[PDB]
Amino acid sequence: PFFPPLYLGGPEITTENCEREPIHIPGSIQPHGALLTADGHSGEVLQMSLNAATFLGQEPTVLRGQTLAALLPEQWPALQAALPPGCPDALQYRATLDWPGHLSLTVHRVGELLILEFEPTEPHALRNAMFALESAPNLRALAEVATQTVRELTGFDRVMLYKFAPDATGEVIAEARREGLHAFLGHRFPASDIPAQARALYTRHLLRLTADTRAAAVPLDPVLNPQTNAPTPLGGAVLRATSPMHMQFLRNMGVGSSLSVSVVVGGQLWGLIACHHQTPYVLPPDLRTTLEYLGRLLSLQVQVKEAADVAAFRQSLREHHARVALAAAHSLSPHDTLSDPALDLLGLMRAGGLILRFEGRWQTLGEVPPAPAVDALLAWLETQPGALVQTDALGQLWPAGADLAPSAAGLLAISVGEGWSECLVWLRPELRLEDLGPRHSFDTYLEEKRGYAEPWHPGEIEEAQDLRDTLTGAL
Amino acid sequence: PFFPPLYLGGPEITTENCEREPIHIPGSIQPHGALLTADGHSGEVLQMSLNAATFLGQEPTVLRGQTLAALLPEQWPALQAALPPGCPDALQYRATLDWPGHLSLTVHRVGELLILEFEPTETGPHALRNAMFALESAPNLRALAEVATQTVRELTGFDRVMLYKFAPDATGEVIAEARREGLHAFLGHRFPASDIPAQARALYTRHLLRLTADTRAAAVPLDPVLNPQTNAPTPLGGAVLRATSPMHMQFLRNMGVGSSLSVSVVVGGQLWGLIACHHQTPYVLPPDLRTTLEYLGRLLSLQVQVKEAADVAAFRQSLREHHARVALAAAHSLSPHDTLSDPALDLLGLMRAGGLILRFEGRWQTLGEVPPAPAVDALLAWLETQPGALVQTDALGQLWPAGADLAPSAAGLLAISVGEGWSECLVWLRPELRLEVDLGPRHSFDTYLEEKRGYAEPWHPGEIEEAQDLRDTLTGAL
Ligand SMILES: *C/C=C1/C(=C/c2[nH]c(/C=C3[NH+]=C(/C=C4\NC(=O)C(C=C)=C4C)C(C)=C\3CCC(=O)O)c(CCC(=O)O)c2C)NC(=O)[C@H]1C
Numbered sequence: 047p048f049f050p051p052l053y054l055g056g057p058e059i060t061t062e063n064c065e066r067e068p069i070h071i072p073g074s075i076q077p078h079g080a081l082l083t084a085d086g087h088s089g090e091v092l093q094m095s096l097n098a099a100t101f102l103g104q105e106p107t108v109l110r111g112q113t114l115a116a117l118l119p120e121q122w123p124a125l126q127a128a129l130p131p132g133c134p135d136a137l138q139y140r141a142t143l144d145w146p147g148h149l150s151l152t153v154h155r156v157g158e159l160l161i162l163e164f165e166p167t168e169p170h171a172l173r174n175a176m177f178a179l180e181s182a183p184n185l186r187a188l189a190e191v192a193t194q195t196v197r198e199l200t201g202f203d204r205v206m207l208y209k210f211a212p213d214a215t216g217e218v219i220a221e222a223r224r225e226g227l228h229a230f231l232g233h234r235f236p237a238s239d240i241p242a243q244a245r246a247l248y249t250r251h252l253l254r255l256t257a258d259t260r261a262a263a264v265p266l267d268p269v270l271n272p273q274t275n276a277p278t279p280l281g282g283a284v285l286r287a288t289s290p291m292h293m294q295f296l297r298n299m300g301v302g303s304s305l306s307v308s309v310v311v312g313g314q315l316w317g318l319i320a321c322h323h324q325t326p327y328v329l330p331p332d333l334r335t336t337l338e339y340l341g342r343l344l345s346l347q348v349q350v351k352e353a354a355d356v357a358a359f360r361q362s363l364r365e366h367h368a369r370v371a372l373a374a375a376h377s378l379s380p381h382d383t384l385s386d387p388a389l390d391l392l393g394l395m396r397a398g399g400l401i402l403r404f405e406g407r408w409q410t411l412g413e414v415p416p417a418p419a420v421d422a423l424l425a426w427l428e429t430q431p432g433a434l435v436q437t438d439a440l441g442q443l444w445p446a447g448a449d450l451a452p453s454a455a456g457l458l459a460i461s462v463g464e465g466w467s468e469c470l471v472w473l474r475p476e477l478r479l480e481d482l483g484p485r486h487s488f489d490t491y492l493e494e495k496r497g498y499a500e501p502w503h504p505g506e507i508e509e510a511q512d513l514r515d516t517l518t519g520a521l
Numbered sequence: 522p523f524f525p526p527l528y529l530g531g532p533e534i535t536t537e538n539c540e541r542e543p544i545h546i547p548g549s550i551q552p553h554g555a556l557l558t559a560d561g562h563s564g565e566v567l568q569m570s571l572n573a574a575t576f577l578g579q580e581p582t583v584l585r586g587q588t589l590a591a592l593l594p595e596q597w598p599a600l601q602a603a604l605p606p607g608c609p610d611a612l613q614y615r616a617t618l619d620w621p622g623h624l625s626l627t628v629h630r631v632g633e634l635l636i637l638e639f640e641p642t643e644t645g646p647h648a649l650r651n652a653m654f655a656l657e658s659a660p661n662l663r664a665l666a667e668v669a670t671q672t673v674r675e676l677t678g679f680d681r682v683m684l685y686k687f688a689p690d691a692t693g694e695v696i697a698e699a700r701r702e703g704l705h706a707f708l709g710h711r712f713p714a715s716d717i718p719a720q721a722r723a724l725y726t727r728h729l730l731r732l733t734a735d736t737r738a739a740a741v742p743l744d745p746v747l748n749p750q751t752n753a754p755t756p757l758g759g760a761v762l763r764a765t766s767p768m769h770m771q772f773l774r775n776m777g778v779g780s781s782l783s784v785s786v787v788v789g790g791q792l793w794g795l796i797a798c799h800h801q802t803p804y805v806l807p808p809d810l811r812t813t814l815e816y817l818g819r820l821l822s823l824q825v826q827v828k829e830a831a832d833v834a835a836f837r838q839s840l841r842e843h844h845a846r847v848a849l850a851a852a853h854s855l856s857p858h859d860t861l862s863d864p865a866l867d868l869l870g871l872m873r874a875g876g877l878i879l880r881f882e883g884r885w886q887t888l889g890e891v892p893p894a895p896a897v898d899a900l901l902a903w904l905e906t907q908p909g910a911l912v913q914t915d916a917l918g919q920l921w922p923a924g925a926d927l928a929p930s931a932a933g934l935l936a937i938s939v940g941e942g943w944s945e946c947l948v949w950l951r952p953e954l955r956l957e958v959d960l961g962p963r964h965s966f967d968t969y970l971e972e973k974r975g976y977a978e979p980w981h982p983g984e985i986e987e988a989q990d991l992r993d994t995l996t997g998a999l
């Protein structure tokens with residue numbers, strides 16, 4: 047449930063309440079440009095940023111209450127045609143203006159209200175890059191080209207590709223940075239660090255920046271909309287003031303400027319091309335457009351490459367599965383055959399541990415909890431219904447196995463025969479990796495993942511239940 | 522199975538054998554630009570188009586056997602780095618050159634051989650950005666397609682821009698059109714599998730752009746025609762400048778099309794369709810502008826998928842409401858026949874059908890346009906022969922030979938048995954397909970309708986699924 051903004055008696059945005067901050071309505075913009083609001087039908091200017099007077103070369107009451115018909119005689123008709131009444135806030139029209147200098151007009155309609163962003167403005171890298179992304183072999187190499195290309199175009203100090211995991215937590219899957227900067231490659235950060243409110247907004251509008259992290263915001267006058275005495279939804283405005291709670295996060299990293307392009311796959315915020323500069327840095331509108339193209343070109347290509355990887359992954363697993371089933375038919379001893387490192391039942395499910403259980407007894411393979419602990423676990427496994435069991439934290443699902451986290455935090459089991467006398471049981475180790483900020487957010491991520499293992503890829507869980515069925519036939 | 526090309530004693534490309542034409546190897550290019558081939562490792566120039574001598578300002582033996590290291594001193598290193606050995610033919614590098622004028626260098630590697638396309642180069646500003654957002658904020662596939670054809674026409678200034686959508690059976694349809702005032706409309710017309718051969722489809726899935734800048738211009742062969750590396754024909758498949766098939770050039774000339782262009786719309790490794798473009802006079806799109814089309818080609822390739830799947834979602838959502846409104850009256854049922862014949866329920870409109878046979882309580886009724894009295898008896902007698910609860914077809918005339926005569930009233934079929942066995946059953950029926958307005962457009966439209974003899978509109982899978990849901994619901998109405 048949202049809070050009111052700071053300008054409507056709303057509360058302090060602390061670190062404990064920040065998931066409720068109304069970030070779509072700061073009623074203020076960044077000072078590198080200027081903002082007007084106007085009535086959708088009449089084109090009557092209603093609101094205005096304080097600096098807008100100066101950005102344009104007209105006096106602060108002369109602009110207010112004026113028509114866009116008069117102000118933008120050439121643009122106003124074509125503008126209005128480009129944005130129908132009732133069309134979505136996602137739809138943006140851009141044109142350039144020739145003024146006393148060159149200005150980049152960016153427009154979008156939030157129903158009744160038109161919003162107008164002004165910024166100052168004036169070869170084949172993108173085309174070559176598009177083809178590079180397409181002819182990349184896998185998601186990792188795709189991500190590398192993405193971060194690399196974005197850095198070559200912008201000249202940012204750091205360009206990460208931040209990938210969201212199923213549990214809303216993030217990971218830097220790729221990085222392209224300046225020589226002599228500390229690497230975030232591989233680091234992971236919690237759900238908390240990018241709130242749901244921001245995620246949801248980043249799914250609608252696929253670009254936002256923070257041109258200077260220490261610059262003061264420029265409020266709107268009036269702050270509230272004369273139409274509806276309601277706060278002006280700047281959610282889909284580039285110039286929107288960035289959250290002060292997040293600006294602080296960036297300042298504590300020594301980030302002078304920020305930028306992030308949303309990578310959206312099938313109406314789902316898959317990730318961000320996240321960018322940092324160590325000094326303030328305003329990307330030109332003409333160049334940001336290039337990023338937005340990549341943002342969508344990547345949004346396609348992620349999906350194509352990622353699904354093609356998952357395909358080739360399970361294809362490895364079918365071959366591995368069928369090589370087990372080969373030796374499982376020609377079986378001298380059920381335990382001997384599966385313990386065999388040539389078969390590698392650990393490597394099929396990529397596991398730190400494994401319990402083979404057959405003929406009224408059990409063996410281990412690899413790193414596994416102590417002798418009595420396994421007996422307790424196998425005793426517990428019989429309690430479960432169905433042929434297949436699964437978890438990313440057996441410590442939770444089974445409280446008495448909290449102590450067994452280090453050797454076996456994550457679990458994937460299957461019963462060979464029905465009932466758990468004869469069964470295979472994969473086990474994975476507890477996960478581990480290498481005040482406000484990323485030092486703390488990395489630590490607090492690992493704190494969120496206490497007694498948590500790497501989760502099981504669905505292809506592994508499916509192939510497990512295939513192997514479950516195959517090994518019943520080995521009897 | 523491919524034929525050899527015309528330059529290796531290969532046969533005449535007739536209209537009956539053309540699905541075998543080796544269109545990836547014409548060993549010739551269009552004269553609006555020039556082409557070099559070079560060795561991948563050494564950069565040694567191997568092949569050359571005849572006009573290349575003149576396009577560059579160097580003599581026809583001076584260029585041959587020369588290094589690219591010498592010829593393109595600044596580009597050759599960056600070029601070579603951009604295209605690794607063993608990288609795919611899809612990957613293209615572009616740069617501009619400053620020569621005695623401006624040239625547009627386009628490069629791609631086919632394994633051992635580098636291929637280099639030269640075109641002359643040097644409006645508009647935010648048209649693409651605005652257009653990208655327009656495509657995104659379009660409400661449906663139809664409106665998306667309209668913005669696409671419209672935008673492409675605004676950028677290029679083509680005489681006609683169609684969006685040609687492939688159907689499941691490889692046949693095409695012009696789902697949208699943006700054309701010049703005073704030109705004959707192809708909007709709605711459909712064309713067979715034959716008119717875009719499998720060889721071309723497959724090539725158009727790999728490389729997402731090809732043109733025909735002048736339909737009556739002569740091709741410019743390569744010298745040597747065969748590759749000095751492997752005495753093998755030079756695979757120009759992924760070259761813009763590749764000579765268009767003469768069999769297709771004839772198709773365009775018989776439409777009065779002077780220039781052509783088409784961008785592939787690929788969805789999930791599948792050739793979904795083409796943004797097809799025509800100009801009535803010859804017209805060479807600038808490289809810098811074609812790039813813009815290629816962006817749209819991919820921006821659309823995403824957006825098609827998003828809009829098309831979101832339409833299919835909202836479609837089946839209509840069908841759940843319709844289904845549940847039937848199941849409402851099916852529980853509160855005075856008479857099984859009376860309730861379903863009711864036009865308020867509209868069992869025709871659920872499956873969008875020209876006919877319907879209601880069969881219950883040892884007898885049958887019709888609704889809408891349906892074959893004669895004895896014909897239905899023969900059909901229902903036949904329906905009992907089929908296994909499973911559900912039956913389906915786009916041509917019952919084929920599946921059931923004795924119902925060939927029944928095509929006009931009922932060419933397409935979707936049936937379901939209420940109880941198990943076909944005593945009690947619902948049977949939707951669709952009319953034979955038809956539409957309104959010796960090689961070209963108006964033969965290919967006629968020959969399409971000839972391919973669709975005794976064929977109805979096919980059943981959308983959402984309709985077939987909802988049919989089998991309704992099948993289960995109406996068993997519970999007993
Ligand atoms: C209690 C709330 C917190 C909070 C709020 C917050 N964060 C954002 C937006 C972003 N946060 C990002 C997080 C990271 N950037 C990094 O570089 C790394 C690690 C290497 C992390 C984890 C990112 C990338 C964004 C997007 C914007 C950008 O690229 O700068 C918002 C929304 C901002 C806006 O647009 O108005 C908010 C409200 N962040 C916290 O850490 C806690 C305190």
Ligand SMILES: *C/C=C1/C(=C/c2[nH]c(/C=C3[NH+]=C(/C=C4\NC(=O)C(C=C)=C4C)C(C)=C\3CCC(=O)O)c(CCC(=O)O)c2C)NC(=O)[C@H]1C
Nearest residue numbers: 536539544707712716717721765766769772781782783797
């Ligand atoms: C027996 C073989 C035939 C044949 C060969 C052929 N066709 C193409 C490429 C295209 N054919 C297209 C068909 C149409 N264009 C239209 O405007 C309409 C109707 C309104 C149709 C049905 C199209 C669009 C293409 C793509 C290229 C373009 O836009 O011009 C090829 C491949 C050409 C190449 O790139 O080398 C071939 C071999 N076409 C026939 O009709 C029969 C005779």
